Scaffold this motif. Structure first.
Motif, mmCIF file in Angstrom:
data_model
loop_
_atom_site.group_PDB
_atom_site.id
_atom_site.type_symbol
_atom_site.label_atom_id
_atom_site.label_comp_id
_atom_site.label_asym_id
_atom_site.label_seq_id
_atom_site.Cartn_x
_atom_site.Cartn_y
_atom_site.Cartn_z
ATOM 1 N N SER A 140 59.365 86.985 113.270
ATOM 2 C CA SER A 140 60.765 87.157 112.869
ATOM 3 C C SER A 140 61.742 86.582 113.913
ATOM 4 C CB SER A 140 61.079 88.633 112.612
ATOM 5 O OG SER A 140 60.541 89.061 111.364
ATOM 6 N N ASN A 141 61.514 86.883 115.194
ATOM 7 C CA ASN A 141 62.377 86.371 116.251
ATOM 8 C C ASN A 141 62.419 84.863 116.280
ATOM 9 O OD1 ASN A 141 63.313 88.825 117.274
ATOM 10 N ND2 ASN A 141 61.528 89.048 118.640
ATOM 11 N N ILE A 142 61.269 84.230 116.065
ATOM 12 C CA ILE A 142 61.226 82.787 116.000
ATOM 13 C C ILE A 142 62.026 82.259 114.798
ATOM 14 C CG2 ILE A 142 59.683 80.839 115.546
ATOM 15 C CD1 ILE A 142 57.680 82.265 117.458
ATOM 16 N N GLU A 143 61.900 82.927 113.659
ATOM 17 C CA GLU A 143 62.540 82.439 112.438
ATOM 18 C C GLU A 143 64.038 82.776 112.344
ATOM 19 O OE1 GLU A 143 59.700 83.661 109.341
ATOM 20 O OE2 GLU A 143 58.731 81.706 109.530
ATOM 21 N N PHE A 144 64.517 83.650 113.230
ATOM 22 C CA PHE A 144 65.953 83.999 113.282
ATOM 23 C C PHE A 144 66.621 83.509 114.575
ATOM 24 C CE2 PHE A 144 64.471 87.993 110.849
ATOM 25 C CZ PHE A 144 64.487 87.290 109.645
ATOM 26 N N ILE B 265 66.250 94.067 113.290
ATOM 27 C CA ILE B 265 65.830 95.402 112.898
ATOM 28 C C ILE B 265 67.038 96.325 112.747
ATOM 29 C CG2 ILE B 265 64.469 97.395 113.586
ATOM 30 C CD1 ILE B 265 62.550 95.439 114.995
ATOM 31 N N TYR B 266 67.995 96.180 113.658
ATOM 32 C CA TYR B 266 69.201 97.006 113.675
ATOM 33 C C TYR B 266 70.148 96.653 112.548
ATOM 34 C CZ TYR B 266 67.439 98.231 118.215
ATOM 35 O OH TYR B 266 66.618 98.635 119.234
ATOM 36 N N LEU B 267 70.355 95.355 112.315
ATOM 37 C CA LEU B 267 71.322 94.908 111.320
ATOM 38 C C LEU B 267 70.886 95.381 109.941
ATOM 39 C CD1 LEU B 267 73.840 93.480 110.393
ATOM 40 C CD2 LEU B 267 72.552 91.330 110.303
ATOM 41 N N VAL B 268 69.586 95.287 109.678
ATOM 42 C CA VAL B 268 69.004 95.793 108.429
ATOM 43 C C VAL B 268 69.353 97.258 108.132
ATOM 44 C CG1 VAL B 268 66.798 96.483 107.412
ATOM 45 C CG2 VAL B 268 67.139 94.163 108.190
ATOM 46 N N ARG B 269 69.127 98.126 109.112
ATOM 47 C CA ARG B 269 69.383 99.552 108.924
ATOM 48 C C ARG B 269 70.861 99.880 108.860
ATOM 49 N NH1 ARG B 269 64.713 102.346 107.692
ATOM 50 N NH2 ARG B 269 62.986 101.209 108.700
ATOM 51 N N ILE B 270 71.679 99.117 109.576
ATOM 52 C CA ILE B 270 73.121 99.321 109.538
ATOM 53 C C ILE B 270 73.688 98.875 108.192
ATOM 54 C CG2 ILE B 270 75.367 98.594 110.501
ATOM 55 C CD1 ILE B 270 73.811 98.575 113.287
ATOM 56 N N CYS B 271 73.168 97.782 107.655
ATOM 57 C CA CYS B 271 73.546 97.380 106.304
ATOM 58 C C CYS B 271 73.116 98.415 105.271
ATOM 59 C CB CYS B 271 72.930 96.036 105.946
ATOM 60 S SG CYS B 271 73.709 94.653 106.793
ATOM 61 N N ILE C 230 67.126 88.304 106.022
ATOM 62 C CA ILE C 230 66.207 89.113 106.809
ATOM 63 C C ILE C 230 65.216 89.788 105.894
ATOM 64 C CG2 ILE C 230 65.895 90.987 108.456
ATOM 65 C CD1 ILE C 230 68.786 90.510 109.356
ATOM 66 N N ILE C 231 65.720 90.343 104.790
ATOM 67 C CA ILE C 231 64.843 90.975 103.797
ATOM 68 C C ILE C 231 63.831 89.987 103.222
ATOM 69 C CG2 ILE C 231 64.731 92.192 101.578
ATOM 70 C CD1 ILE C 231 65.861 93.772 104.040
ATOM 71 N N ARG C 232 64.296 88.794 102.852
ATOM 72 C CA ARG C 232 63.384 87.790 102.278
ATOM 73 C C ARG C 232 62.288 87.386 103.259
ATOM 74 N NH1 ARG C 232 63.759 83.732 97.834
ATOM 75 N NH2 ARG C 232 62.588 81.841 98.393
ATOM 76 N N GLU C 233 62.670 87.191 104.513
ATOM 77 C CA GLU C 233 61.712 86.806 105.538
ATOM 78 C C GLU C 233 60.692 87.930 105.783
ATOM 79 O OE1 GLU C 233 61.229 87.897 108.836
ATOM 80 O OE2 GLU C 233 60.013 86.221 109.558
ATOM 81 N N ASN C 234 61.179 89.168 105.829
ATOM 82 C CA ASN C 234 60.315 90.334 105.994
ATOM 83 C C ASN C 234 59.375 90.475 104.800
ATOM 84 O OD1 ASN C 234 62.712 92.635 107.605
ATOM 85 N ND2 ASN C 234 61.679 90.787 108.347
ATOM 86 N N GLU C 235 59.909 90.293 103.589
ATOM 87 C CA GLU C 235 59.095 90.382 102.373
ATOM 88 C C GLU C 235 57.996 89.335 102.391
ATOM 89 O OE1 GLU C 235 61.942 90.070 99.183
ATOM 90 O OE2 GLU C 235 62.293 92.243 99.121
ATOM 91 N N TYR C 236 58.316 88.146 102.898
ATOM 92 C CA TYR C 236 57.302 87.106 102.903
ATOM 93 C C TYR C 236 56.169 87.464 103.859
ATOM 94 C CZ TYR C 236 54.467 83.051 102.971
ATOM 95 O OH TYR C 236 53.368 82.219 102.908
ATOM 96 N N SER C 237 56.517 87.917 105.063
ATOM 97 C CA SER C 237 55.483 88.283 106.020
ATOM 98 C C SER C 237 54.657 89.454 105.490
ATOM 99 C CB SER C 237 56.078 88.611 107.386
ATOM 100 O OG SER C 237 56.472 87.430 108.070
ATOM 101 N N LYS D 296 54.606 96.502 97.127
ATOM 102 C CA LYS D 296 54.728 97.554 98.122
ATOM 103 C C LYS D 296 54.761 97.008 99.554
ATOM 104 C CE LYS D 296 53.565 101.549 95.529
ATOM 105 N NZ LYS D 296 53.506 103.017 95.799
ATOM 106 N N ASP D 297 55.579 97.623 100.393
ATOM 107 C CA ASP D 297 55.767 97.190 101.774
ATOM 108 C C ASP D 297 54.992 98.047 102.768
ATOM 109 O OD1 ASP D 297 57.784 97.723 104.378
ATOM 110 O OD2 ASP D 297 57.507 95.639 103.899
ATOM 111 N N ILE D 298 54.263 97.389 103.659
ATOM 112 C CA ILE D 298 53.662 98.048 104.803
ATOM 113 C C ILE D 298 54.335 97.738 106.141
ATOM 114 C CG2 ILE D 298 51.426 98.235 103.690
ATOM 115 C CD1 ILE D 298 50.578 95.964 105.732
ATOM 116 N N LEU D 299 55.104 96.646 106.151
ATOM 117 C CA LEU D 299 55.625 96.108 107.398
ATOM 118 C C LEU D 299 56.607 97.053 108.099
ATOM 119 C CD1 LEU D 299 57.199 93.968 109.403
ATOM 120 C CD2 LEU D 299 57.479 92.587 107.381
ATOM 121 N N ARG D 300 57.452 97.716 107.333
ATOM 122 C CA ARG D 300 58.393 98.650 107.952
ATOM 123 C C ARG D 300 57.686 99.840 108.559
ATOM 124 N NH1 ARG D 300 64.447 99.170 105.414
ATOM 125 N NH2 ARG D 300 64.720 96.917 105.041
ATOM 126 N N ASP D 301 56.712 100.394 107.847
ATOM 127 C CA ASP D 301 55.987 101.557 108.375
ATOM 128 C C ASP D 301 55.189 101.187 109.621
ATOM 129 O OD1 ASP D 301 56.952 103.435 106.609
ATOM 130 O OD2 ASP D 301 55.237 103.300 105.238
#
Lengths: 150, 151
Positions: B20-24, B35-41, B102-109, A2-7
């Protein structure tokens, strides 16, 4: 998992947007209110310490700080121990506005928690404290220029 | 005065964006552009007004980010037969190929954020944050339209 980061990101952006609208006429928008709050609470703090408190980037912080200075809400004072790193203080005007920022934040906080029992609130706060700590370490690691395995 | 959750949410959010900014940084996806590219995709053909409402950000900020993504060949604006004044936002092929990173990096954090938590402790938090998001979303809308809060 489950994700919290987006919220978390959406809640934070929504709160800042609201504050910016409510402080629009008082030179405290564009996110500047966050800086004045910390500077009032930590009088004499240097910018690099402030940046570490806020977990923001240096250039964003610099822009906000100089604008608060331009609008007479904070003032930079001589640091006898390190000339490069001036001490940040609120001005009288900045201190007089501080309670307004706190009140606005408290109101949003009450809105955010509408419908929570006191039991629900207490675990939410301790969990967030735990979340904060988990990511602070990685923030510091990555800020120092080290690379994560992901 | 009830306990505050807002300061911690703000610091968590800023810390995550900074990582995220550092890693991208080398991929033209920093300065919060990811953040924008994710939602547009994830919403191909979305108009900027709708993207702004999903993100709960201001028009000027979103405009700047979208223009920069278009400059760097990550998204493209297409004509809108239903309202030519509001163009449709699509990812480019390049944008689409970078989306999974972007998704993988976000998932990791996200996994790091949830470290040390018991499973049970994770379920309570997810629901609570959804509740918070909904509560704040209404006020954002109320205020964006020009209505005044009583505080």
């Amino acid at each position: 998992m489950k994700d919290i980061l987006r919220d978390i990101g959406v809640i934070a952006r929504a709160l800042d947007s609201i504050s910016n609208i409510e402080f629009k006429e008082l030179n405290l928008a564009k996110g500047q209110f966050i800086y004045l709050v910390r500077i009032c609470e930590n009088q004499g703090i240097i910018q690099e310490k402030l940046v570490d408190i806020l977990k923001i980037d240096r250039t964003t912080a610099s822009r906000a700080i100089k604008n608060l200075e331009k609008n007479g809400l904070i003032i930079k004072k001589q640091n006898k121990n390190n000339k490069k790193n001036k001490l940040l203080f609120p001005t009288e005007k900045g201190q007089q506005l501080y309670p307004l920022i706190i009140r606005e934040n408290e109101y949003s906080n009450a809105v955010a928690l509408k419908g929570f029992t006191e039991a629900e609130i207490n675990m939410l706060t301790d969990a967030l404290k735990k979340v904060k700590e988990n990511i602070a370490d990685d923030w510091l690691y990555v800020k120092k220029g080290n690379k994560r395995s992901y």
